[PDB]
Amino acid sequence: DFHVGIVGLGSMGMGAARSCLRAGLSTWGADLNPQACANLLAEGACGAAASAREFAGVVDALVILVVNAAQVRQVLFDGVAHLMKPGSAVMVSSTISSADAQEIAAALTALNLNMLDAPVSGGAVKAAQGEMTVMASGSEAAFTRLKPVLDAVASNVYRISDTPGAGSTVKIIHQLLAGVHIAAAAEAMALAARAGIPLDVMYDVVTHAAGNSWMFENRMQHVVDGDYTPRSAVDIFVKDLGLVADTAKALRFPLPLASTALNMFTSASNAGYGKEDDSAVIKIF
Amino acid sequence: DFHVGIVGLGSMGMGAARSCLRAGLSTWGADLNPQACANLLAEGACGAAASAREFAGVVDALVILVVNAAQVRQVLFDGVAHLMKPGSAVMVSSTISSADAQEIAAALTALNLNMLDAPVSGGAVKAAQGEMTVMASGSEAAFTRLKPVLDAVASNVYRISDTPGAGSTVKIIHQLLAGVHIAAAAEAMALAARAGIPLDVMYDVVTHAAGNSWMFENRMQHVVDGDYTPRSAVDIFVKDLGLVADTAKALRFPLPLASTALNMFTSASNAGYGKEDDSAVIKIF
Numbered sequence A, B: 001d002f003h004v005g006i007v008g009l010g011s012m013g014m015g016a017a018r019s020c021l022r023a024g025l026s027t028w029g030a031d032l033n034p035q036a037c038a039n040l041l042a043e044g045a046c047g048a049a050a051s052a053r054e055f056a057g058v059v060d061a062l063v064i065l066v067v068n069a070a071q072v073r074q075v076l077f078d079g080v081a082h083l084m085k086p087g088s089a090v091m092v093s094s095t096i097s098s099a100d101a102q103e104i105a106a107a108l109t110a111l112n113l114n115m116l117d118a119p120v121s122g123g124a125v126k127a128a129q130g131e132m133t134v135m136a137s138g139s140e141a142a143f144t145r146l147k148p149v150l151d152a153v154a155s156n157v158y159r160i161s162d163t164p165g166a167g168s169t170v171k172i173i174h175q176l177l178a179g180v181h182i183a184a185a186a187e188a189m190a191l192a193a194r195a196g197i198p199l200d201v202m203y204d205v206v207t208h209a210a211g212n213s214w215m216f217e218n219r220m221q222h223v224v225d226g227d228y229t230p231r232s233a234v235d236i237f238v239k240d241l242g243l244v245a246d247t248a249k250a251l252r253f254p255l256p257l258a259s260t261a262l263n264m265f266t267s268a269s270n271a272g273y274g275k276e277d278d279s280a281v282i283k284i285f
């Protein structure tokens, strides 16, 4: 049978793991959250532990859904890359630089492993339904080996290039929009509040008009409900928009709006809202 | 029967007129475009001319879908307000200040006419299907008189307040999002181009990911196709974001992103792209 290990059981990771289970793949999970692991076991997983060292040696594919490159490197190099069998594939689905994706791929290739630069999007709901959007780049060997996984976790896979790096570049550009949209939504709702317009009313209008955005609809519900419990933290976009900034600077390209959004999220973090839901950026107002 | 006159047969206006015709209302149209008028006549309109002076005296309701307050005032005060019969209603669906909506309403009330501060949104496609989103405020008399029209042209009507002004305030906030989203989309696509990512590919990814926006999906298709033929001009947002700026300043409220977008559209206009599609803001890059 096909064995796939999912490392990182956050909202996106759990969705992927459940989608793999529905697809009938032998699924293993790894996360420091004992409750995420227990749920997966209760749902049919072959195994679930704090790390993937217990099953890395038998999986045909390992999917890594973590926050940053540092965490990807920690999972791979108590690392598990050296335990993986020749020909197995590693699908890196985080938000890293093109350089890091290439550096990581080179290290894995040396171990006769295939890597797919495959950052994802689509939201937690879509993920739970196996309807992720994947922006991937990598060898034919990686794409072929991971087909069972991609078919299970995703509904839209975009093959950007045949070499690691391009996928992460696309993800970076995508995060520019995600970040700016959250900040713009916050700016508009704070103005609405200041103008005396009920936020629930403002929310309904926008979500039924031409000014709507996926991020407005998703994040501004948190604002209307006054629930800043972190789904995705402010600090995530401080990091992501920082990566966007670096990419643009390397290309000598100006970012009027992305630089502004980065400053807004950065202000929200210095104000102490760094670990709160990213919609908390509205608090700088 | 119920007679309704539609003044301003642009994309939104034609949709409203056709929706009124489908609803079985006696429909009249007014626009300087002889081709818009001819099409309406061919479709069953009672009349269609350059101005509404020919039918203003018999309509139960007059809908004004124009670009700005100046044009609303020109239609009302060769004006037609004084020709309208007592009890008739005027639905102003433009993008004007709250002050202007109130000033215009007062003038119409003095003539025993009802006015509805009813700016709209939803896009041309929705408009043609009678599925507009209306953010309206005004008296019970105005809402009641216009019900036949609202039922025909709209699918979502939000009654903001019982007095003219609030509707326009909501529209202003909405335009902040519409404007920022177009500019953010342009910024992201220009960066994508600079980074060497095919725009059609970047478009497909975004429109299937969490960074999508109604404006990105609508306007960036123009960019992918390289067609800057004006559907809605750059100068429209120079005007609209200018109104947003004034609203915020009056409230002593800062707009990091909206002020940036205004500067971008303003730059695009000074560069000579003012009359081109608003997606042409991408040309400042």
Ligand SMILES: [Cl-]
Binding pocket: A129, A130, A131, A150, A151, A152, A153, A154, A155
């Ligand atoms: Cl699927």
Ligand SMILES: [Cl-]
Binding pocket: B129, B130, B131, B150, B151, B152, B153, B154, B155
């Ligand atoms: Cl309708």
